[PDB]
């Protein structure tokens, strides 16, 4: 019918029921339970009304811990006897004890081995902390098992830097200082991390490759899997996470160099010393790891539901999020999975009424995402020819709730205005602000640094399923979820993240009780999808892009101005880049002026201008791609090789500029910087010409 009919049709009770449904048993990727869930989702989508639902299967590499031999960590004395043992399995949550599909805590794609040796604390295991480790702390990390705390960095970069330093084994634990909200109890009497709680994740530096055995091509039935030696992103070091109870029993005994900084400390009753070994009478004891996990090729299934368009069936608007989870995962992704299922049900009801979208909509319950983006990347690779010439935008959906403060939205600049325009029509679910727009609350609590009246919209960055659609194929990507008070809380993400305690009861009592914040996140994502699919003209704005573009230019300029003298000796000039941005600005202004008054009654010209807007994003990727990262093609928002978490724009220049002071040949490095500036300026000018007048 219209926008409002779809928006109101969304029901919090249905999301409640679906979240109850998907969280009673584990649904780990590549298992019979996940296959049954995929079949159930396919059948539900078919009976809702979806035009065509397929079960696209791919034989992709995955990892599991073997049942007979469990994985754990131990403290071994000189005589060889084991002293302390790490929890073989975190305590089952109340109400979930009979279920035996809960896998023990483990990190995916961790190679087998039984490393033995001393332990060194490396804080958040960032590049900076390693930099402290050798330059000033004078500690040789090579040949020693390492212990790291989560936060501020993806696990992949953590293990990568650990390998570079020469670590023999990597141990991951959550520090309550960064994973225990003050004033809140632990599960099952709070939403903090119990001492048995262990966070889980995959150690993969895929760099958008996808399946580590078939980079660039789908893992079809006839495919040729590369050898395990030539795999991409596979770590060469065993890694297994633990909690903070057992970590404290191990952290306390270690002794040596005192922490150099206050940031080198936490809430646990530990000296938090950095020095290797355990001081005192127990110097002989050392850490020993016991990973016996296996990597095998397992068939994963992506449930793709296509609802055919009515006017432009070729144009696909994709909305999808993963469904695999280490444990029940009531918050990741089943919280988002239920949201996606509710949008699918509402769209099916609308189709049953008779309404037809103006563009074909592709819903996709992905798979194997917790093992790297695997499934989504493989399905994109399979249909790259169709998507990169027909796709419009990809609206990701995952972890709708992480705290009840506001609505955090990360989207490409093209639909910035849309994110604003949609948010004004909605209603605030938060404390206070009854009857006021979600936009007003979002601005009040999360104001944009430039404009007080504007809300703050962050960039896409990396992670999740939008990576392959945005950073490789150049398709607009958007994300929206309810977020906490990052201003006044420290814990990055909710404390009960990727653990057994991610049950339905957690999300109900210690998070959105009425499932109203879930309702509003579903409203936002479904509204973005509906606007992208049922707009006569593509609802993008080039001008904002141009605007924000200048910003990052200055940013990428400023870092270079950290070395003015060098910028004069090698004639390094951003004037080409600045002229490119100024071009982009003027040409985008002219294009928007044309768009404001160009005739819409002619389908040919309308298709022309919609193609212009759609390929404007696709004008930014370069087929050569970023250096050493062919699958990262965006030159504006692709994650950098260093400081991938931070997400600084113009990644090529930033990686060229990163650590530019310590280079053996300054002339060659600055020449590479000039090359990156030339590439970026050419790409911006090419996008501007793509937006320029045709013929």
């Amino acid at each position, epitope marked *: 019918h219209n926008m409002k009919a779809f928006l109101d049709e969304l029901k919090a009770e249905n999301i409640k029921k679906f979240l109850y449904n998907f969280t009673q048993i584990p649904h780990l990727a590549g298992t019979e339970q996940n296959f049954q869930l995929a079949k159930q989702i396919q059948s539900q989508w078919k009976e809702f009304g979806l035009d065509s639902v397929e079960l696209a299967h791919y034989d992709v590499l995955l990892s599991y811990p073997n049942k007979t031999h469990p994985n754990y960590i131990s403290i071994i004395n000189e005589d060889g006897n084991e002293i302390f043992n790490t929890s*073989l399995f975190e305590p089952p949550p109340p109400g979930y004890e009979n279920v035996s599909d809960i896998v023990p805590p483990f990190s995916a794609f961790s190679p087998q081995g039984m490393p033995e040796g001393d332990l060194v604390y490396v804080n958040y295991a960032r590049t900076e902390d390693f930099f402290k480790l050798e330059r000033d702390m004078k500690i040789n990390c090579s040949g020693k098992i390492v212990i790291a705390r989560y936060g501020k960095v993806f696990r992949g970069n953590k293990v990568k830097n650990a390998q570079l330093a020469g670590a023999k084994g990597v141990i991951l634990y959550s520090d309550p200082a960064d994973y225990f909200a003050p004033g809140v109890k632990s599960y099952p009497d709070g939403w903090n991390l119990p001492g048995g709680g262990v966070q889980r994740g995959n150690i993969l530096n895929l760099n958008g490759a996808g399946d580590p055995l078939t980079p660039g091509y789908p893992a079809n039935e006839y495919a040729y899997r590369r050898g395990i030696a030539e795999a991409v992103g596979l770590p060469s070091i065993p890694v297994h996470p633990i909690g903070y109870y057992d970590a404290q029993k191990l952290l306390e005994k270690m002794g040596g160099s005192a922490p150099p900084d206050s940031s080198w400390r936490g809430s646990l009753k530990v000296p938090y010393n950095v020095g290797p070994g355990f001081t005192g009478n127990f110097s002989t004891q050392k850490v020993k790891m016991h990973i016996h996990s296996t990597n095998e090729v397992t068939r994963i299934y992506n449930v793709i539901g296509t609802l055919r368009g009515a006017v432009e069936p070729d144009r696909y608007v994709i909305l999808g999020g993963h469904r695999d989870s280490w444990v029940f995962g009531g918050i990741d992704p089943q919280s988002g999975a239920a949201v996606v299922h509710e949008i699918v049900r509402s769209f099916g009801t609308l189709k049953k009424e008779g309404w037809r979208p103006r563009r074909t909509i592709l819903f996709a319950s992905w798979d194997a995402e917790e093992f790297g983006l695997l499934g989504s990347t493989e399905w994109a690779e399979e249909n790259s020819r169709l998507l990169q010439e027909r796709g419009v935008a990809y609206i990701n959906a995952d972890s709708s709730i992480e705290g009840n403060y506001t609505l955090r939205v990360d989207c490409t600049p093209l639909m910035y205005s849309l994110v604003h325009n949609l948010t004004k029509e909605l209603k605030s679910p938060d404390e206070g602000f009854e009857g006021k727009s979600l936009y007003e609350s979002w601005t009040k609590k999360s104001p944009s640094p430039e404009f007080s009246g504007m809300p703050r919209i962050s960039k896409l960055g990396s992670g999740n399923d939008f990576e392959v659609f945005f950073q490789r194929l150049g398709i607009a990507s958007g994300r929206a979820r309810y977020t906490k008070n990052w201003e006044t809380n420290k814990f990055s993400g909710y404390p009960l993240y990727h653990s057994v305690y991610e049950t339905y009861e957690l999300v109900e009592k210690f998070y959105d009780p009425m499932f109203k914040y879930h309702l509003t996140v579903a409203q936002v994502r479904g509204g973005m999808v509906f606007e992208l699919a049922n707009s006569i003209v593509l609802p993008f704005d080039c001008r904002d892009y141009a605007v924000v573009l200048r910003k990052y230019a200055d940013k990428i300029y400023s870092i270079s101005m950290k070395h003015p003298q060098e910028m004069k000796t090698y004639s390094v000039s951003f004037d080409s880049l600045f002229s490119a941005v100024k071009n982009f600005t003027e040409i985008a202004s002219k294009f928007s002026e044309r768009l404001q008054d160009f005739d819409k009654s002619n389908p040919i010209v309308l298709r022309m201008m919609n193609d212009q807007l759609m390929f404007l994003e696709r004008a930014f990727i370069d087929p050569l791609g970023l250096p050493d990262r062919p699958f990262y093609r965006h030159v504006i928002y692709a994650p950098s090789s260093h400081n991938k978490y931070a997400g600084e724009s113009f990644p090529g220049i930033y990686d060229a500029l990163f650590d530019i002071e310590s280079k053996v040949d300054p002339s060659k490095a600055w020449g590479e910087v000039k090359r990156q500036i030339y590439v970026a300026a050419f790409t911006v000018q090419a996008a501007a010409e793509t937006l320029s007048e045709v013929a």
Partner: nanobody
Framework: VQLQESGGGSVQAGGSLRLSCARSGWPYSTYSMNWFRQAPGKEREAVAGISSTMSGIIFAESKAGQFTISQDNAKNTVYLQMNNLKPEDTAIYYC?????????????????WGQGTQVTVS
């Protein structure tokens, strides 16, 4: 809640005594039981402990090969296995239980206390 201690003996040396303590009537899913060795005229020191998560640590690390600790939830019991008994090991042992699964060596924390089995060594 009842915690019975079994495994009495009077081995002079080199014993293989098999101490056992079970949670009969224990209503909490999570348990963190350890053993205390009360010496004659000395405060009961914690020996070794195991949680409901198979996470266990021995506290008498000077007796690493002396003592081993295990458990099984089939018959709901925890086990202490000792080899090469020493004359100074003569003491009265209690198994102590607690809901919170953080392994600890605090006597006052461990509210539940069993009757205790006395091992006399010659």
């Amino acid at each position: 809640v009842q915690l019975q201690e079994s495994g009495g003996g009077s081995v002079q040396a080199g014993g293989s005594l098999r101490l056992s303590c079970a949670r009969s009537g224990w209503p909490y899913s999570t348990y963190s039981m350890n053993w205390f060795r009360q010496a004659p005229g000395k405060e009961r020191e914690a020996v070794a402990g195991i949680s409901s998560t198979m996470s266990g640590i021995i506290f008498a690390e000077s007796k690493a090969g002396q003592f081993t600790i295990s458990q099984d939830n089939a018959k709901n019991t925890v086990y202490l296995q000792m080899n090469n008994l020493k004359p100074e090991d003569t003491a009265i042992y209690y198994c102590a239980a607690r809901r919170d699964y953080s392994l600890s060596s605090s006597s006052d924390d461990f509210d539940y206390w069993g009757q205790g089995t006395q091992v006399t060594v010659s």
